[PDB]
Amino acid sequence: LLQKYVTWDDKSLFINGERIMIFSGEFHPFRLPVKELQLDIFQKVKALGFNCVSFYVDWALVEGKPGEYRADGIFDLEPFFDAASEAGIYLLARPGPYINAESSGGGFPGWLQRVNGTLRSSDKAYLDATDNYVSHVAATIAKYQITNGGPIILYQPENEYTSGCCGVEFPDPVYMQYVEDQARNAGVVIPLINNDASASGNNAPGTGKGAVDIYGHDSYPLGFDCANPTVWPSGDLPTNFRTLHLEQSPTTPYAIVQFQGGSYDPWGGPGFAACSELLNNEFERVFYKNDFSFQIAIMNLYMIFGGTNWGNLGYPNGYTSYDYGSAVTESRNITREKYSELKLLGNFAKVSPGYLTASPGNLTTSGYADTTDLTVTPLLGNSTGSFFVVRHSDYSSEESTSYKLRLPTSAGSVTIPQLGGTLTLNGRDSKIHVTDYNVSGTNIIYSTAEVFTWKKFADGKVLVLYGGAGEHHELAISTKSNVTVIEGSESGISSKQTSSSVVVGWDVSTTRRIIQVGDLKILLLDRNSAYNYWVPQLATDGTSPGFSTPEKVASSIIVKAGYLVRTAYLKGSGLYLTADFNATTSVEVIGVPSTAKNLFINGDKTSHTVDKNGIWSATVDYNAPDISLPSLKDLDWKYVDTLPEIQSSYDDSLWPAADLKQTKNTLRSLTTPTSLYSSDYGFHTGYLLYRGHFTATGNESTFAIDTQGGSAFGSSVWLNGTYLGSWTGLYANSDYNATYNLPQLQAGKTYVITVVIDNMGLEENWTVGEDLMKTPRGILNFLLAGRPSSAISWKLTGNLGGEDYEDKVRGPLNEGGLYAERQGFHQPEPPSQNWKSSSPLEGLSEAGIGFYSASFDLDLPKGWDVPLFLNIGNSTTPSPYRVQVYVNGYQYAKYISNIGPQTSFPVPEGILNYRGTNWLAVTLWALDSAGGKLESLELSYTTPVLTALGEVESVDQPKYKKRKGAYH
Ligand SMILES: *[C@@H]1O[C@H](CO)[C@@H](O[C@@H]2O[C@H](CO)[C@@H](O[C@@H]3O[C@H](CO[C@H]4O[C@H](CO)[C@@H](O)[C@H](O[C@H]5O[C@H](CO)[C@@H](O)[C@H](O)[C@@H]5O)[C@@H]4O)[C@@H](O)[C@H](O[C@H]4O[C@H](CO)[C@@H](O)[C@H](O)[C@@H]4O[C@H]4O[C@H](CO)[C@@H](O)[C@H](O)[C@@H]4O[C@H]4O[C@H](CO)[C@@H](O)[C@H](O)[C@@H]4O)[C@@H]3O)[C@H](O)[C@H]2NC(C)=O)[C@H](O)[C@H]1NC(C)=O
Ligand SMILES: *[C@@H]1O[C@H](CO)[C@@H](O[C@@H]2O[C@H](CO)[C@@H](O[C@@H]3O[C@H](CO)[C@@H](O)[C@H](O[C@H]4O[C@H](CO)[C@@H](O)[C@H](O)[C@@H]4O[C@H]4O[C@H](CO)[C@@H](O)[C@H](O)[C@@H]4O[C@H]4O[C@H](CO)[C@@H](O)[C@H](O)[C@@H]4O)[C@@H]3O)[C@H](O)[C@H]2NC(C)=O)[C@H](O)[C@H]1NC(C)=O
Ligand SMILES: *[C@@H]1O[C@H](CO)[C@@H](O[C@@H]2O[C@H](CO)[C@@H](O[C@@H]3O[C@H](CO)[C@@H](O)[C@H](O[C@H]4O[C@H](CO)[C@@H](O)[C@H](O)[C@@H]4O[C@H]4O[C@H](CO)[C@@H](O)[C@H](O)[C@@H]4O)[C@@H]3O)[C@H](O)[C@H]2NC(C)=O)[C@H](O)[C@H]1NC(C)=O
Ligand SMILES: OC[C@H]1O[C@@H](O[C@@H]2[C@@H](O)[C@@H](O)O[C@H](CO)[C@H]2O)[C@H](O)[C@@H](O)[C@H]1O
Ligand SMILES: *[C@@H]1O[C@H](CO)[C@@H](O)[C@H](O)[C@H]1NC(C)=O
Ligand SMILES: *[C@@H]1O[C@H](CO)[C@@H](O)[C@H](O)[C@H]1NC(C)=O
Ligand SMILES: *[C@@H]1O[C@H](CO)[C@@H](O)[C@H](O)[C@H]1NC(C)=O
Ligand SMILES: *[C@@H]1O[C@H](CO)[C@@H](O)[C@H](O)[C@H]1NC(C)=O
Ligand SMILES: *[C@@H]1O[C@H](CO)[C@@H](O)[C@H](O)[C@H]1NC(C)=O
Ligand SMILES: *[C@@H]1O[C@H](CO)[C@@H](O)[C@H](O)[C@H]1NC(C)=O
Ligand SMILES: [Cl-]
């Protein structure tokens, strides 16, 4: 339409005039702010057989001060795009402005709490607020479009523009047209795709003003209750998606822009381990092949890698981890069985062009399989091949089921197995059986076992098939050649020739068989062996794979290995592999180029042998080095009191006055004389402090206060030095009403009420018109008994400077309003010479907030990817306390002793300096009159990985420097 690089028809996208199935994974650059590790993820995604990544940009992190766009350093999108290009991964850009994403504000900066207009509407005050952000981020995206030689192929305007309320005329075509035009005016010419939250046809082609180019929708059919990870409720597997597609957008490729790849988890939830169990390998093979049954041509998994809600970037209901239960874990490992299962499907799609040109039919409980206990969805092609997606009719069934197939083929209709036996579907599994499947001119008439990959090499063709344990399978090939078993036993392998075919039966075994039919070799694997195979693209013109184009797909090799194979290239007489290892690994290479005489693994020449069938073999030894981690309790811990506000000498004369008589918040008008909403004064993040001055009559008895921080927030209150009490917090409370008893006061004396409030983040704004992102933080009501409300004059602070935030490197959300944070003491090399020697393990003996500093050295070996974790102990029921840990100035843990569940906090290399000095700053807030302390504080590691990753450069880590704007 505006360019010829990315086009489409009813069946699929075309990239440079060639059909491609887009298999994508969601990855948010702001949740892993280390550019070398961004390349790591992209390479792990490419190794799944995927060709695409989808990303959000978080407006709240890049325009913290209105009118100042800052996507630099750790927030630079450009190295992220270069990493995607280097890995050979196309991009779906989703800059918002609204993203939801379990992020603070759903992407919106807290200054949108002062916008006189409905958020996500055609109100001029909202639209004007978005212009600076979109014109920047969309210009940066424009520069990296595929039209300019970059990786970006699709653009999403808005996010799930689906639900409206409260006087908005939803859907507003003027609003969506405006959002689309902002992107176009910045230079975006690639297609626009939306992501309707349900299949509701919103903004579909043909709806006129506000219509996108390709209609997309989302689906989370298993929901977000990770507490019952084995429960698959009846009727939750979608069945009508293709029907809906043909009613809502028949002229565009069927697209699911967010399909479930995991789940979020709230404060106090079951943990992301439970989420990984619910959305495990069984979920993937059943639910993802089900999406294939609808002829999905654009499929994006939310999330593929989740990362970390570091520096308060997350929404209030979520905690620091955003592991998501996804295929790549928070610490970047690919140990989960769901990664390996996903790789099998991803590699199937990469090499099966007939999948896109076939004609999908409706699901059937008879006609294809000989029992109604199975359902079969046919995708019928003629010369280009057919596909048959098999599953249990009751999709949750764990039963083992025997069956036979009746499949049409170019050689006639056939009942399978022809040579005896039955097929088996064991429990929560699904299969894509194929007919007339093209392997570079050799026709596979049928195969019951599933295709992992195939390639044409100079010496012949190779096909890799797999089945689960206990399965009997069968295939037939259009040929007059006979079959020979060239590796493994002939036991269990049966065969027969007809006048123009050969038929082969086999039982799945843990030992590989290789059969040969003419110039076709066929690997017959069990699923668990297939998990260990990889299909890197073979570069001959450099070291980089390139994108998944037809030539570069065709020119790939097959590698059996272990943990990971990243890349492969041919240079002279050398075949080079880059790979990672977590155990001693037997490496095999199938389809070695005829010119190669030497094998290199991670730059090192490696002995190989060649077997009778031309397969190269080598061993890579794994010998983990000594990982020597310092004992965090034995460090030279220095303490400073980070609540000096409750000392009677404290002078708050430089604090901002909370003296606005009118709020600028349209959602909730004031119920106090002046606004005590933090965002009215530009404070949107971290701990908030309020100070209320009054002169006592002497007859004051109680002080009531409604505080609001979001779900699981807490607050504590003091009258001068006297602790009044705390709200210790519950996930179920986003606000709380407390009445505290005052001590006897002296008539005529001045007192100051100090209130500390945990801002858990700003709410999302999922429903258009509800304006829930405007939900204020701070003090909603107060009453000093027998005194008018105007008797208290309030001061407040959050992060120093508010929207004129101090730390341009670490961004606008990283630090809150504690004294120690305002002073910059959380950064490397604080002025702690003359501070007291005390540890968070000793802690506090009364209510309050302590600040702790220590350094430690790491000297971990080069060439190893070693995941490190901060651990906070909770082996027995604790007193209520709250902790933040800053690592070299970056907040990478937020902890609530009484709510949880996170005790283990991954911190990536780059934030940590693996061969240098590191700084921990810990805040301990005891919401208890007896005080509190840490049970234990420990640095740990998991399996070291012998890695191909280059050196991880440390991100910028500005050291402590005195701040003139501070209140001292
Ligand atoms: C180096 O990197 C390697 C990757 O390259 C990495 O290797 C991977 O390691 C992970 C573990 O970290 C492996 O995943 C696990 O695999 C377990 C072993 O079973 C696998 O292998 C068997 C053959 O050797 C197969 O027979 C088996 O298939 C069968 O079971 C499948 C899943 O249940 C099923 O889909 C198949 O159809 C078939 O029936 C399988 O492939 C596996 O048992 C384990 O399963 C569970 O764990 C998951 C959560 O992590 C859940 O998603 C899943 O539902 C299972 O949960 C159960 O077990 C948990 C304990 O681990 C409990 O927490 C759960 O509550 C639940 O427990 C119930 O059921 C249990 C069995 O009855 C029992 O414990 C209880 O009684 C309870 O009722 C998991 O998927 C992965 O396969 C490896 N990948 C490769 C490629 O090898 C290696 O670890 C790395 N090394 C180092 C040192 O870091
Ligand atoms: C250190 O160790 C200690 C000791 O082991 C740990 O302390 C324990 O921490 C538990 C987890 O925080 C805590 O359990 C909680 O207790 C409260 C009540 O006091 C309860 O509300 C919690 O259950 C809900 O919330 C969680 C999410 O936080 C959900 O996963 C769960 O399904 C429940 O959800 C319901 O309420 C939510 C909000 O109200 C809703 O969003 C949700 O949809 C659902 O609502 C429906 O049901 C409600 C009734 O259940 C009802 O309001 C309505 O009908 C709704 O439809 C959870 O049980 C333990 O109390 C605590 N134990 C002790 C001995 O202190 C500590 O966490 C550990 N720390 C770390 C760091 O690991
Ligand atoms: C792949 O990535 C995922 C996500 O990043 C990794 O999964 C996380 O792994 C960590 C580390 O194993 C895990 O945290 C542990 O959970 C255990 C509960 O299931 C806890 O028992 C354990 O705490 C103990 O060990 C710590 C040291 O590691 C101590 O500091 C801590 O105080 C606890 O130690 C006490 O208890 C143990 C035994 O109970 C005893 O031996 C000690 O002496 C002491 O008394 C950790 O909290 C997370 O739960 C995992 N997160 C998720 C979401 O799954 C996974 O490990 C990565 N895999 C690889 C191979 O890298
Ligand atoms: O990680 C969750 C994911 O949710 C997506 O949105 C919503 C979900 O929150 C719910 O309210 O409705 C539908 C179905 O569950 C779902 O699309 C959202 O687009 C993402 O940004 C995430 O928040
Ligand atoms: C099979 O692949 C070959 C080689 O790429 C191609 O020339 C041929 O047209 C394909 N056949 C069918 C029926 O799609
Ligand atoms: C085909 O191969 C099978 C197994 O090796 C064998 O039984 C059969 O005799 C062969 N057929 C011919 C015609 O050689
Ligand atoms: C209470 O503390 C303030 C400063 O926070 C101080 O100026 C005032 O004198 C104190 N009042 C009493 C009665 O000690
Ligand atoms: C928003 O603007 C209207 C119209 O000018 C005005 O009446 C109202 O007071 C404003 N509200 C806020 C909260 O600023
Ligand atoms: C002091 O407060 C008490 C309790 O509210 C009230 O009964 C009494 O009248 C008050 N005394 C004075 C002197 O104002
Ligand atoms: C606190 O009181 C206010 C005003 O009376 C009320 O709106 C709110 O629901 C109360 N909050 C809780 C958590 O009870
Ligand atoms: Cl200060």
Q: What's the 3-state SS for 409-456?
A: CCCCCEEECCCCCCEEEECCCCEEEEEEEEECCEEEEEECCEEEEEEE
1-354: CATH architecture = Alpha-Beta Barrel (3.20)
Q: Candidates 302, 303, 309, 322: which one to mutate for ligand 4, based on the most atoms within 8 Å of Cβ?
A: 302
Phi, then psi, of 207 in degrees rounded to 5? -85, -5
> Which amino acid is it at 381?
G
229: its two tokens: 């990870």
Phi, then psi, of 918 in degrees rounded to 5? -130, 150
Determine whether the shortest distance from the Cβ of 197 to ligand 4 is under 6 A: yes
Strand segments, DSSP code E, in 17-162 are 18-20, 22-26, 52-56, 90-96, 152-157
Distance (Å, rounded) from C-alpha 624 to C-alpha 950? 18
Handedness of CA 32, 34, 37, 38 (dihedral sign): positive
Name the strand (E) or helix (H) holding 467.
Answer: strand 460-467
Chain position carrying tokens 């507490």: 227
Neighbours of 184 (CB within 10 A): 15
Q: How far is the CA of 237 from the centre of ligand 1 (A)?
A: 24
Q: How many residues does the chain have?
A: 968
Name the strand (E) or helix (H) holding 277.
Answer: helix 272-278
Phi, then psi, of 451 in degrees rounded to 5? -85, 125
Whether residue 503 contacts residue 418, with contact meaning beta carbons closer than 8 Å, is answered with yes
- Which ligand does the CA of 480 lie closest to? 6
Q: How far is the CA of 120 from the centre of ligand 8 (A)?
A: 18
| 558 phi-psi bin (left φ>0, alpha ψ -120 to 50, beta other) | beta
155: its two tokens: 């653009």
Per CATH, the number for 355-533 is 2.102.20.10
Whether residue 248 contacts residue 209, with contact meaning beta carbons closer than 8 Å, is answered with no
Whether residue 780 contacts residue 708, with contact meaning beta carbons closer than 8 Å, is answered with yes
Chain position carrying tokens 């000096």: 644
Q: How far is the CA of 624 from the centre of ligand 1 (A)?
A: 23
Measure CA of the first residue to CA of the last residue in the chain; give whole Å.
61
Neighbours of 77 (CB within 10 A): 21
581 by Cβ neighbours in 10 Å (0-12 / 13-18 / 19+) ranks as buried
Q: Which atom of ligand 4 is nearest to the CA of 223?
A: 15
CA distances from 348 to 289, 314, 363, 437 (A): 11, 36, 21, 12
Q: How far is the CA of 53 from the centre of ligand 8 (A)?
A: 42
Which is nearest to 192 in space by CA: 152, 241, 228, 250? 152
Residue nearest to atom 4 of ligand 9 (CA): 699
Which is nearest to 721 in space by CA: 929, 564, 886? 929
Residue nearest to atom 22 of ligand 4 (CA): 101
Q: Which atom of ligand 10 is nearest to the CA of 735?
A: 13
Neighbours of 486 (CB within 10 A): 14
Distance (Å, rounded) from C-alpha 356 to C-alpha 581? 35
832 by Cβ neighbours in 10 Å (0-12 / 13-18 / 19+) ranks as buried
Distance (Å, rounded) from C-alpha 154 to C-alpha 7? 10
Whether residue 328 contacts residue 345, with contact meaning beta carbons closer than 8 Å, is answered with no
Chain position carrying tokens 């392998």: 493
Which of the 8 DSSP states describes residue 145?
Answer: B
Which of the 8 DSSP states describes residue 742?
Answer: P
Q: How far is the CA of 639 from the centre of ligand 3 (A)?
A: 28
Mention every residue, 6+ apart, whose C-beta is less than 8 A from residue 489.
Answer: 511, 513
For ligand 10, which residues put their CB under 6 angstroms from it?
706, 733, 735-737, 781
Distance (Å, rounded) from C-alpha 920 to C-alpha 825? 11
Which of the 8 DSSP states describes residue 198?
Answer: S
Q: Candidates 735, 775, 779, 783: which one to mutate for ligand 10, based on the most atoms within 8 Å of Cβ?
A: 735
Which is nearest to 128 in space by CA: 114, 148, 141? 114
Q: How far is the CA of 263 from the centre of ligand 2 (A)?
A: 18
189 by Cβ neighbours in 10 Å (0-12 / 13-18 / 19+) ranks as middle
Q: Where in the chain is the domain with CATH 2.60.390.10?
A: 534-622
PDB resolution in Å: 2.5
> Which amino acid is it at 789?
S
Distance (Å, rounded) from C-alpha 159 to C-alpha 195? 6
Looking at 3.30.1340.30, 2.60.120.260, 3.90.25.10, 3.40.50.10140, the CATH number of the domain 623-642+819-968 comes to: 2.60.120.260
Distance (Å, rounded) from C-alpha 534 to C-alpha 517? 23
Q: Candidates 669, 672, 706, 734: which one to mutate for ligand 10, based on the most atoms within 8 Å of Cβ?
A: 706
Q: Which atom of ligand 10 is nearest to the CA of 706?
A: 1
- Which ligand does the CA of 315 lie closest to? 4
- Which ligand does the CA of 286 lie closest to? 1
441 by Cβ neighbours in 10 Å (0-12 / 13-18 / 19+) ranks as exposed
Which is nearest to 904 in space by CA: 923, 877, 926, 885? 885
SS3 (DSSP) at 920 = strand
Distance (Å, rounded) from C-alpha 752 to C-alpha 915? 48
Distance (Å, rounded) from C-alpha 906 to C-alpha 869? 4
Sheet hosting strand 638-641, strand order edge to edge: 836-837, 638-641, 848-859, 915-926, 881-887, 890-896
Q: Candidates 112, 114, 116, 126: which one to mutate for ligand 8, based on the most atoms within 8 Å of Cβ?
A: 116
Which is nearest to 157 in space by CA: 172, 144, 175, 171? 175
Q: Which atom of ligand 2 is nearest to the CA of 896?
A: 71
626: its two tokens: 């000594």
Chain position carrying tokens 């959300």: 813
**HSE (CB half, 13 Å, CA atoms) of 480?**
1
47: its two tokens: 């190794």
Q: What is the 3-state secondary structure (H, E, C) of 315-367?
A: CCCECCECCCCCCECCCCCCCCHHHHHHHHHHHHHHCCCHHHHCEECCCECCC
SS3 (DSSP) at 513 = strand
Sheet hosting strand 90-96, strand order edge to edge: 152-157, 90-96, 52-56, 22-26, 298-302, 255-260, 217-219
Sheet hosting strand 735-741, strand order edge to edge: 735-741, 702-708, 778-784
- Which ligand does the CA of 727 lie closest to? 10
Q: Candidates 309, 897, 942: which one to mutate for ligand 3, based on the most atoms within 8 Å of Cβ?
A: 942
Distance of CA 370 to the CA centre of its chain: 41
**HSE (CB half, 13 Å, CA atoms) of 28?**
28
Distance (Å, rounded) from C-alpha 281 to C-alpha 260? 13
Which is nearest to 556 in space by CA: 19, 47, 21? 47
Bridge partners of 375, per DSSP, are 391
453 by Cβ neighbours in 10 Å (0-12 / 13-18 / 19+) ranks as buried
Q: Where in the chain is the domain with CATH 3.20.20.80?
A: 1-354
Whether residue 111 contacts residue 682, with contact meaning beta carbons closer than 8 Å, is answered with yes
- Which ligand does the CA of 116 lie closest to? 8
Q: Candidates 737, 779, 782: which one to mutate for ligand 10, based on the most atoms within 8 Å of Cβ?
A: 737
Domain 643-818 has CATH 3.40.50.12780: no
Whether residue 537 contacts residue 88, with contact meaning beta carbons closer than 8 Å, is answered with yes
Whether residue 77 contacts residue 35, with contact meaning beta carbons closer than 8 Å, is answered with no
Which is nearest to 330 in space by CA: 37, 85, 731? 37
Q: How far is the CA of 438 from the centre of ligand 5 (A)?
A: 7
Residue nearest to atom 8 of ligand 6 (CA): 482
Distance (Å, rounded) from C-alpha 771 to C-alpha 125? 14
Which is nearest to 340 in space by CA: 535, 510, 531, 579? 531
> Which amino acid is it at 905?
F
80: its two tokens: 């992220």
User: How large is the greatest C-alpha to C-alpha distance in the chain, in angstroms?
Assistant: 110
Whether residue 509 contacts residue 492, with contact meaning beta carbons closer than 8 Å, is answered with yes
SS3 (DSSP) at 919 = strand
SS3 (DSSP) at 567 = strand
Helices (H) and strands (E) in the chain, counts: 14, 56
Distance of CA 912 to the CA centre of its chain: 21
Whether residue 309 contacts residue 272, with contact meaning beta carbons closer than 8 Å, is answered with no
Determine whether the shortest distance from the Cβ of 384 to ligand 5 is under 6 A: yes
SS3 (DSSP) at 144 = coil
Residue nearest to atom 9 of ligand 5 (CA): 441
* Cis upstream peptide for 944 (omega within 30°): no
- Which ligand does the CA of 585 lie closest to? 1
Phi, then psi, of 133 in degrees rounded to 5? -60, -50
Q: How far is the CA of 968 from the centre of ligand 11 (A)?
A: 5
Distance (Å, rounded) from C-alpha 495 to C-alpha 484? 10
Percentage helix, strand, coil, to 5, in the chain? 15, 35, 50
Go through 905-938 and write b for each residue having 16 or more CB atoms within 10 A of its CB, e for each that does not: bbbbbbbbbbeeebbbbbbbbbbbeebbbbeebb
- Which ligand does the CA of 114 lie closest to? 8
Residue nearest to atom 14 of ligand 8 (CA): 664
Determine whether the shortest distance from the Cβ of 942 to ligand 1 is under 6 A: no
Neighbours of 600 (CB within 10 A): 16
Phi, then psi, of 470 in degrees rounded to 5? 80, 0
Distance (Å, rounded) from C-alpha 196 to C-alpha 203? 8
The angle formed by the CA atoms of residues 772, 778 and 781, to the nearest 5 degrees, is 100
Distance (Å, rounded) from C-alpha 109 to C-alpha 112? 6
DSSP secondary structure string for all residues of 88-125: T-EEEEEEES---TTBGGGG--GGGGG-SS-TTSS-HH
Name the strand (E) or helix (H) holding 84.
Answer: helix 77-87
Distance (Å, rounded) from C-alpha 146 to C-alpha 156? 15
Neighbours of 657 (CB within 10 A): 13
Q: Candidates 898, 904, 924, 934: which one to mutate for ligand 2, based on the most atoms within 8 Å of Cβ?
A: 898
Whether residue 815 contacts residue 798, with contact meaning beta carbons closer than 8 Å, is answered with no
Whether residue 312 contacts residue 891, with contact meaning beta carbons closer than 8 Å, is answered with yes
Distance (Å, rounded) from C-alpha 124 to C-alpha 126? 5
Distance (Å, rounded) from C-alpha 77 to C-alpha 360? 39
The residues after which the chain has a C–N gap greater than 2.5 Å are none
- Which ligand does the CA of 646 lie closest to? 7
SS3 (DSSP) at 81 = helix
Mention every residue, 6+ apart, whose C-beta is less than 8 A from residue 916.
Answer: 857, 858, 954
Q: How far is the CA of 788 from the centre of ligand 9 (A)?
A: 15
Name the strand (E) or helix (H) holding 578.
Answer: strand 574-580
Mention every residue, 6+ apart, whose C-beta is less than 8 A from residue 807.
Answer: 814, 815, 824, 889, 958
SS3 (DSSP) at 136 = helix
Residue nearest to atom 86 of ligand 1 (CA): 531
Q: Where in the chain is the domain with CATH 2.60.120.260?
A: 623-642+819-968, 643-818
- Which ligand does the CA of 503 lie closest to? 6
Determine whether the shortest distance from the Cβ of 666 to ligand 5 is under 6 A: no
- Which ligand does the CA of 354 lie closest to? 5
Q: Which atom of ligand 7 is nearest to the CA of 645?
A: 5
Q: How far is the CA of 692 from the centre of ligand 8 (A)?
A: 28
Q: How far is the CA of 722 from the centre of ligand 10 (A)?
A: 26
**HSE (CB half, 13 Å, CA atoms) of 248?**
23
Distance of CA 476 to the CA centre of its chain: 42
Which of the 8 DSSP states describes residue 231?
Answer: -
Distance (Å, rounded) from C-alpha 702 to C-alpha 713? 23
Whether residue 704 contacts residue 754, with contact meaning beta carbons closer than 8 Å, is answered with no
Distance (Å, rounded) from C-alpha 146 to C-alpha 324? 30
Go through 850-860 and write b for each residue having 16 or more CB atoms within 10 A of its CB, e for each that does not: bbbbbbbebeb
Whether residue 545 contacts residue 567, with contact meaning beta carbons closer than 8 Å, is answered with yes
The angle formed by the CA atoms of residues 528, 529 and 532, to the nearest 5 degrees, is 100
Handedness of CA 663, 669, 670, 676 (dihedral sign): negative
Which of the 8 DSSP states describes residue 133?
Answer: H
550: its two tokens: 């037809």
Q: Which atom of ligand 9 is nearest to the CA of 785?
A: 5
Determine whether the shortest distance from the Cβ of 873 to ligand 3 is under 6 A: yes
Whether residue 919 contacts residue 954, with contact meaning beta carbons closer than 8 Å, is answered with no
Determine whether the shortest distance from the Cβ of 668 to ligand 8 is under 6 A: no
Distance (Å, rounded) from C-alpha 170 to C-alpha 162? 8
Distance of CA 530 to the CA centre of its chain: 26
Q: What is the 3-state secondary structure (H, E, C) of 754-806?
A: EEEEECCCCCCCCCECCCHHHCCCEEEEEEECCCCHHHCEEEEECCCCCCCCC
Determine whether the shortest distance from the Cβ of 666 to ligand 8 is under 6 A: yes
* Cis upstream peptide for 97 (omega within 30°): yes
Bridge partners of 446, per DSSP, are 435, 476
DSSP secondary structure string for all residues of 566-625: EEEEEETTEEEEEEEBSS-EEEEEES--TT--EEEETTEEE--EE-TTS-EEEEE---PP
Residue nearest to atom 58 of ligand 2 (CA): 268
Which is nearest to 471 in space by CA: 536, 403, 555? 403
Phi, then psi, of 638 in degrees rounded to 5? -110, 135
Distance (Å, rounded) from C-alpha 254 to C-alpha 11? 7
Q: Where in the chain is the domain with CATH 2.102.20.10?
A: 355-533
Mention every residue, 6+ apart, whose C-beta is less than 8 A from residue 19.
Answer: 11, 12, 13, 353, 356, 357
Q: How far is the CA of 846 from the centre of ligand 7 (A)?
A: 20
Whether residue 322 contacts residue 316, with contact meaning beta carbons closer than 8 Å, is answered with no
Q: How far is the CA of 962 from the centre of ligand 7 (A)?
A: 28
The experimental technique used to determine this model is X-ray
The angle formed by the CA atoms of residues 915, 919 and 920, to the nearest 5 degrees, is 130
Distance (Å, rounded) from C-alpha 310 to C-alpha 103? 11
Mention every residue, 6+ apart, whose C-beta is less than 8 A from residue 314.
Answer: 102, 103, 104, 320, 322, 761
Phi, then psi, of 181 in degrees rounded to 5? -70, -30
The superfamily CATH assigns to domain 534-622 is: Beta-galactosidase, domain 3 (2.60.390.10)
Distance of CA 497 to the CA centre of its chain: 51
Chain position carrying tokens 């009613």: 247
